[PDB]
Design a binder for this molecule. Structure first.
Ligand SMILES: Nc1ncnc2c1ncn2[C@@H]1O[C@H](COP(=O)(O)OP(=O)(O)OP(=O)(O)O)[C@@H](O)[C@H]1O
Ligand SMILES: Nc1ncnc2c1ncn2[C@@H]1O[C@H](COP(=O)(O)OP(=O)(O)OP(=O)(O)O)[C@@H](O)[C@H]1O
Ligand SMILES: Nc1ncnc2c1ncn2[C@@H]1O[C@H](COP(=O)(O)OP(=O)(O)O)[C@@H](O)[C@H]1O
Ligand SMILES: [Mg+2]
Ligand SMILES: [Mg+2]
Ligand SMILES: [Mg+2]
Lengths: 81, 460, 503, 187, 477
């Protein structure tokens, strides 16, 4: 579904923003727990970016399929006349 | 008049072939040889003296060759004060079992919209008493309102709140058009209007006229019943000078019914399968709802949004025909907050400081802004938690939750406009940041909020 | 071009039989017979083919009739003779049908002998208007705690059971049917509910298993089963819900109360779409015809509660809808969601989480609401409802809420307790008194001490105890419909004693 | 009811109506009679006044069928052809009747056993060798058969003959031999 | 005479199949019997498809259709200024007939390549966000795209009102004649808009073409081209024009309906094949003519209504690929207090920097760079970026129906970008802004005068600006 994928994408995007901001502030305060926080938030941000890439692929696939399905509906409806 | 014959009957579409006297489009034809009156509305001329028609009731039992008589005019309904308190269907027959509607005037349901020079600019706000509506997107006299929402968000109950408050606090011969809605809810509304004194079966001082074409009707009936309601309200405005109310519930069915006819009318489908002629037909309908120099028709329209989309062709097309839209959201309805009005999706054209004033306008903008920032901060609280954030940020989250609670309104409440803006200012400035969040839930003004806070604190 | 412009008609027409009450098949294929002649036939009139097969005149066209065939078209050839019968469809109704399994036309298919009813009723009758009805007031007891508590159904309501495949919709309907045994076994006639189960496009083995389940629960002697299975012609699966609705409208019109379950309406919409596409009607969204909303709406609007001046009977509908991958934004789910008075939405995620009946309370709704509840269930269900709403609103942050306020922790704990409270096993529908007893023991605070994994054991033990030792309290709560202050104190006494003696 | 299908089968509304007419006439043996009838009908219609009277889509079907029934009672036409024109007025396929006429002609054109031969040459054909080629083309047939030979000329084919017997086709022209020799020297 | 006169053969939901008219031209205006006019869009072998400029209840099978001999044309000229007309040029304001002396076709070809010159002179909108971050030049096509109720018509009306200071001055080549085409709008909304423009004395130079929601689909399809020809008049006669289409989505919907009922093969979302063509050949007529052709111009501000901010829909895709930029308006920024709700990270102006005035160029370069870095970062250096960005975005807000002169905008943005508002905290800037304006308006007419006359901030004017702003910041609450 297109709207579900869009909602989940926006979710993971704001999560990636938050985790990269936390990586920034942790690398700032680290200048043994701040180091762990910085590396963990780096891991979280890159993992969120991977999930965003995969969900973006699936979103493009789904929106192409949606365009196809609606065009085939319109075409088969026009051909019955 | 002109006599034709039925040649084809496909579902709810009937083709009639006239020897002489071809009837223009939108004319009404009567089918002869039936116990109940079956009206067919002309839609297309197909050549060879054949017209295509949409039936106003079920088409079972029709025979190829059955005689059909031409009315010579569109569907003409009885209009006048004798329609007040009665229930009529799409073709103007009474369906309340009280006898005929003895009026002096008949009006065709297909008429042209008012001109350009007949337009009025006067915009006088109508206060309804509800904090969320009258605060964020308040209603204006003479303008179309619109109440969007999915299935189960509270559109019917909202229109019933409005019926109670407004239609009783008004003196302008309201009209209720039930466009393809549940017969159970229609019977409920009729009976609770009767026992509320708005409808008087004896010594008729009634002030609401009801029009009902319900769900089990064919698509043509549910497409023209809103036009019937419009025609009644147009009489009460034009030839009566009154300021009319028009509660159309639910308008999407109207649009929906349009779709269901176009399929069989031999027309290529548009997006979402809607008809090619959606926008302009809904426009010819919605442009008759307006304030002219003769009178006003302020219309409260409940609009069904399929799957809570709001980008579907029907709601997206309706949005432009409205003056103060208040969208009922499902995500807010699952929170238990009622009414489910979406504060960041309800827009009013009279929410400008030239009409409501700088104080009300500032409260509205501040509430909407703090709710938007609350949703934004919900990101960081969903990742980390509020106990890891700034000072004024969690203070803002607390104030925003308090505002979300105070937007609710149940015993029923009546919160005047100045009292409403006062309460919301007192919450916004933070004057009551010590009172708990659930003291503002399901209360009236700030007084009942602080009182419920006192009580809840006294026990727990 | 031209259906009737075949060379045979043309040559014997230019050259020189009753073509008013009789026609000849021009073309037969895929169950759609085009018939030349039948000039007097009515729309939706039932006609008779030469082979004994029946048909329904669905497309009245200028030069031919598109007839949908009620069977296998191998017995219909071009040139066959088609006669009129002059009548629309009609099915036998009455008390003689209870306990019988019939097909979509009212013919017995259980081999117990022919139906012995005296009255017949049309299947395409109209619904009662605005005036003959009255508000839905009387409770229709399902025996399912989640339904009877949070999604209450009243007599005259139309409650949709919607969900993906294999989530528990048929089980909910069957528990509802089985529950009415306690009312139909009594003598009070205005609490008896006669059930009708319309099986649309299922296996015959599934309907056989269902009839066995109803017989082993002694719930067939007041049930009718209308069976239009998967091998039956699309017209029969199209027509089965209306036959069932007429069988229930007999009970409605005569002062009795009927319940009807369409299982399910997705397959009825599929059969209608097949008939419409083969009749060359212009397809719409997902190839569905333009008047499929009209189909389901005209069907479901016949479930009504009549006022005392019209007998006082009622008909309750429980349509079933199967969604594909949880997508309720489809065509038929959207239509039937907009038509009905609420939906009992079943989840798959919730089903495999041990929450079964897998009712999603956040998405379920009932427009009648507490107006269809007894006073006791109302008293407990209001607080239960608000409690669960708060819990679900704050449960987006569970599994970590122990690092926060006591308020959030207590909301989450009470919510997990209450969700463990609503679980229920199959084929065991509880009487309303026992449901109220459990919800009382749950919501007034008598579960904050038990860790969530033992709430089911407590539920079972507590019901055993209160059915063994407290029959008088349950009987007075049954007679009163409400928890009296004396009965309130007795309930508190019992639950305190039990939680004291509980392990 | 059983139908008699002609040896050639024509398609379209034209073919369907002409097939109906042929299978009606074959049950009563009035084939050349109704041929004469439709010849007269076509020459009746081809005059401009009545043609515009029946080609007008504004004249209502009863009026135009009235004029048609009047004019067919004028010429004492057989009930078969009157019924056929009545059906063309009923189904509204009337303006196309000319094709039907032509169709029926071609149908009976294979009832008497004629085959159409078309001979194209680069030069306007002589008389002697033209009759010679007529005799040669007659030898490719069965008995009871007739040649409808119509020789038109194409001066672009650079020589030889292009003969078309039915749809059988022999290309003895010289331009094709030139093209073939060029293709041979090229591949 | 079935060659200049046809007879209606079929009629259905706006489409007339007319038999006859053997000599009619494609897209020619024909006249039905009841008075309604139509356009011959389909020329088929047996009939003509005519789209009716009216209703179907008035025409029925058998009616007569006469031929005009000319393609669809509209009265153009000076006489239309102040007048509200419909899609055909007929006056609907009740003020009498149009005294138009010139008619002009509606489907003309856009000017070629040689007649043009680069877009160099600014079209002043009077809006700070636009004039600073998304500048528009005279000859440009700037899209105004956004969801419902986001402030698009308000941007258009603020532009139309702002042109008043130039239309009352002296220099003829700085005046601008505005045109507002209303497609699918409410008639009430158009009446109230005409009132808004009349109150601000902005009708004497404005033409309003109105194809409201109650008008036939052919009229809504035609109104943009009628307005465009009315503007092309001023463009070709050495004057400068501005034209707003509000909005093009509804014209595309009307055309989709027309073509679907003419049985033309539908495409994506049932739009015809040439629905791109429909808009491109409309938005290509907005051009800037070189001085060898008069030196005129025609600026287009088309409006587009997206659904849930989807700019990859079919019609938004087309019009984004056609125009020279766009101004995105967002609801999420609408409610955060950002008004006008212009999303600046997405708003583009390809030919904008060449249009800005030198002073606004100076201040807006720095403003855009600072907002860019702030949006990119949105300790002891990064929250400096945050603070500057917050103060600037608080400086961008503006009220409705009150457009500012260019020198006032330069003064405000200059106070903002030099760091003078680094002292005041966010919720103060707006206050200062208003007060500051009064100051620079009342006692300091010479500085604004020289900035308007010279077009730039000379170092004398720069020093005067900085001393003014520090003197006002010192004695400000
Ligand atoms: N409350 C329950 N407790 C335990 N198991 C249940 C419950 N409800 C249903 N089930 C089980 O889930 C399975 C599927 O349930 P069921 O077939 O009744 O629902 P359905 O929606 O009709 O499925 P289908 O798509 O096959 O028709 C069954 O094995 C059933 O026993
Ligand atoms: N800069 C602004 N400041 C304050 N309010 C504004 C501003 N711009 C617009 N508004 C208000 O927002 C509301 C809607 O704006 P507007 O009608 O101009 O945009 P729109 O997209 O054309 O709406 P529609 O969808 O009806 O066409 C108006 O009431 C207007 O007063
Ligand atoms: N005062 C109230 N108390 C409890 N529930 C309410 C109240 N008002 C409305 N509701 C609920 O609002 C929901 C929406 O009802 P309805 O108005 O029919 O929805 P809609 O019109 O949006 O489809 C129903 O479930 C109803 O029970
Ligand atoms: Mg509703
Ligand atoms: Mg099942
Ligand atoms: Mg606008």
């Amino acid at each position: 579904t297109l709207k579900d994928i869009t909602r989940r994408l926006k979710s993971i995007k704001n999560i990636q923003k938050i985790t990269k901001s936390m990586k920034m502030v942790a690398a700032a305060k680290y200048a043994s727990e701040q180091s762990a926080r910085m590396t963990a938030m780096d891991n979280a941000s890159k993992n969120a970016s991977e999930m965003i890439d995969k969900l973006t692929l699936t979103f493009n696939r789904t929106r192409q399929a949606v365009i196809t399905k609606e065009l085939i509906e319109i075409i088969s409806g026009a051909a019955a006349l | 008049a002109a006599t034709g014959r039925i040649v084809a009957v496909i579902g709810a579409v009937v083709d009639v072939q006239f020897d002489e006297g071809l009837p223009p489009i939108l004319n009404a034809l009567e089918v002869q040889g039936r116990e109940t009156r079956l009206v067919l509305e002309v839609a297309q001329h197909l050549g060879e003296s054949t017209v295509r028609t949409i039936a106003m009731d079920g088409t079972e039992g029709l025979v190829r060759g059955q005689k059909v008589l031409d009315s010579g005019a569109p569907i003409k309904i009885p209009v006048g004060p004798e329609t007040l308190g009665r229930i009529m269907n799409v073709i103007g027959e009474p369906i309340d079992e009280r006898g005929p509607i003895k009026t002096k005037q008949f009006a065709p349901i297909h008429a042209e919209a008012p001109e350009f020079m007949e337009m009025s600019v006067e915009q006088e706000i109508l206060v309804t008493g509800i904090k969320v509506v009258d605060l964020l997107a308040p209603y204006a006299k003479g303008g179309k309102i619109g109440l969007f929402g999915g299935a189960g968000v509270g559109k019917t109950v909202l229109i019933m709140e409005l019926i109670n408050n407004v239609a009783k606090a008004h003196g302008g011969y309201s009209v209720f058009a039930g466009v393809g809605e549940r017969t159970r809810e229609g019977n409920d509304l009729y009976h609770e209007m009767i026992e509320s004194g708005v409808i008087n079966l004896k010594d008729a001082t009634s002030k609401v006229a009801l029009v009902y074409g319900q769900m089990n009707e064919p698509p043509g009936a549910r497409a023209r019943v809103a036009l019937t309601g419009l025609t009644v309200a147009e009489y009460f405005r034009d030839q009566e000078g009154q300021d009319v109310l028009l509660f159309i519930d639910n308008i999407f069915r109207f649009t929906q019914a349009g779709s269901e006819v176009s399929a069989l009318l031999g027309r290529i489908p548009s997006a979402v399968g809607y008809q090619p002629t959606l926008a302009t037909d809904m426009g010819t309908m919605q442009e008759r709802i307006t304030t002219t120099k003769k009178g006003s028709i302020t219309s409260v329209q409940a609009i069904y949004v399929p799957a809570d989309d709001l980008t579907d062709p029907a709601p997206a097309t309706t949005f432009a025909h409205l003056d103060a839209t208040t969208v009922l959201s499902r995500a807010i309805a699952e929170l238990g907050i009622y009414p489910a009005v979406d504060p960041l999706d309800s827009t009013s054209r009279i929410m400008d400081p030239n009409i409501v004033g700088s104080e009300h306008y500032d409260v509205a903008r501040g509430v909407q802004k703090i709710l938007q920032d609350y949703k934004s901060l919900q990101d960081i609280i969903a990742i980390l938690g509020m106990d890891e954030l700034s000072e004024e940020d969690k203070l803002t989250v607390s104030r925003a939750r308090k505002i979300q609670r105070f937007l609710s309104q149940p015993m029923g409440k009546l919160v005047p406009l100045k009292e409403t803006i006062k309460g919301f200012q007192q919450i916004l400035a933070g004057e009551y940041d010590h009172l708990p969040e659930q003291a503002f839930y399901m209360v009236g003004p700030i007084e009942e909020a602080v009182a419920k806070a006192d009580k809840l604190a006294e026990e727990h | 071009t031209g259906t009737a412009e075949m060379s045979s008609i043309l040559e014997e027409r230019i050259l020189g039989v009753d073509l008013e009450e009789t026609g000849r098949v021009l073309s037969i294929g895929d169950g759609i017979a085009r018939v030349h002649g039948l000039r007097n036939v009515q729309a939706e009139e039932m006609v008779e083919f030469s082979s004994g097969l029946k048909g329904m005149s669905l497309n009245l066209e200028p030069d031919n009739v598109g007839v949908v065939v009620f069977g296998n078209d191998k017995l219909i050839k071009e040139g066959d003779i088609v006669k009129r019968t002059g009548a629309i469809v009609d099915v036998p109704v009455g008390e003689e049908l209870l306990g019988r399994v019939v097909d979509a036309l009212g013919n017995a298919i259980d081999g117990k002998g022919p139906i012995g009813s005296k009255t017949r009723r049309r299947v395409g009758l109209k619904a009662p208007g605005i005036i003959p009805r009255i508000s839905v007031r009387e409770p229709m007891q399902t025996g399912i705690k989640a339904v009877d508590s949070l999604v209450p159904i009243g007599r005259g309501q139309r409650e949709l059971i919607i969900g993906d495949r294999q989530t528990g919709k048929t089980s909910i309907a069957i528990d509802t049917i089985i529950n009415q045994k306690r009312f139909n076994d009594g003598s009070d006639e205005k609490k008896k509910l006669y059930c009708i189960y319309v099986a649309i496009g299922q296996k015959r083995s599934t309907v056989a298993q269902l009839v066995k389940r109803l017989t082993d629960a002694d719930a067939m002697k007041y049930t009718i089963v209308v069976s239009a299975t998967a091998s039956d012609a699309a017209p029969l699966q199209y027509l089965a819900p209306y036959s069932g609705c007429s069988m229930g409208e007999y009970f409605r019109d005569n002062g009795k109360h009927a319940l009807i379950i369409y299982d399910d309406l997705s397959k009825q919409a599929v059969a209608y779409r097949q008939m419409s596409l083969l009749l060359r009607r212009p397809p719409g969204r997902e190839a569905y015809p333009g008047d499929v909303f009209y189909l389901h709406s005209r069907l479901l609007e016949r479930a009504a509660k009549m006022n005392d001046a019209f007998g006082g009977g009622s008909l309750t509908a429980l349509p079933v809808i199967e969604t594909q991958a949880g997508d309720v934004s489809a065509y038929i789910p959207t239509n039937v969601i907009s038509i009905t008075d609420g939906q009992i939405f079943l989840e798959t995620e919730l089903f495999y989480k041990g929450i079964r009946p897998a009712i999603n309370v956040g998405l379920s709704v009932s427009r009648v609401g507490s107006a269809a509840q007894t006073r006791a269930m109302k008293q407990v269900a209001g607080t239960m409802k608000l409690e669960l709403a708060q819990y679900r609103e704050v449960a987006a942050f569970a599994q970590f809420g122990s690092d926060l306020d006591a308020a959030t922790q207590q909301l989450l704990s009470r919510g997990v307790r209450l969700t463990e409270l609503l679980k229920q096993g199959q084929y065991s529908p509880m009487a309303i008194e026992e449901q109220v007893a459990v919800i009382y023991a749950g919501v007034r605070g008598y579960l904050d001490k038990l860790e969530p994994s033992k709430i089911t054991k407590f539920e079972n033990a507590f019901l055993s105890h209160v059915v063994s030792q407290h029959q008088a309290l349950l009987g007075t709560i049954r007679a009163d419909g409400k928890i009296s202050e004396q009965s309130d104190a007795k309930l508190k006494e019992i639950v305190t004693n039990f939680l004291a003696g509980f392990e | 009811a059983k139908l008699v299908r002609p040896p050639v089968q024509v398609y379209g509304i034209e073919g369907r109506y002409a097939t109906a007419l042929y299978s009606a006439a074959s049950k009563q043996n009035k084939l050349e009679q109704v041929e004469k009838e439709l010849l007269r009908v076509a020459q009746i219609l081809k005059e401009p006044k009545v043609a515009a009277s029946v080609l007008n889509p504004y004249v209502k079907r009863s009026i135009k069928v009235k004029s048609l029934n009047d004019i067919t009672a004028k010429e004492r036409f057989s009930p078969l052809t009157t019924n056929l024109i009545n059906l063309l007025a009923e189904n509204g396929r009337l303006s196309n009747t000319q094709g039907v006429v032509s169709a029926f002609s071609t149908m009976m054109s294979v009832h008497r056993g004629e085959v159409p031969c078309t001979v194209t040459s680069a030069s306007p054909l002589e008389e002697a060798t033209l009759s010679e080629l007529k005799t040669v083309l007659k030898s490719f047939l069965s008995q009871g058969q007739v040649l409808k030979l119509e020789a038109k000329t194409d001066p672009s084919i650079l020589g030889g003959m292009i003969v078309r017997i039915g749809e059988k086709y022999v290309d003895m022209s010289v331009k094709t031999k030139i093209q073939k020799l060029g293709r041979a020297m090229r591949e």
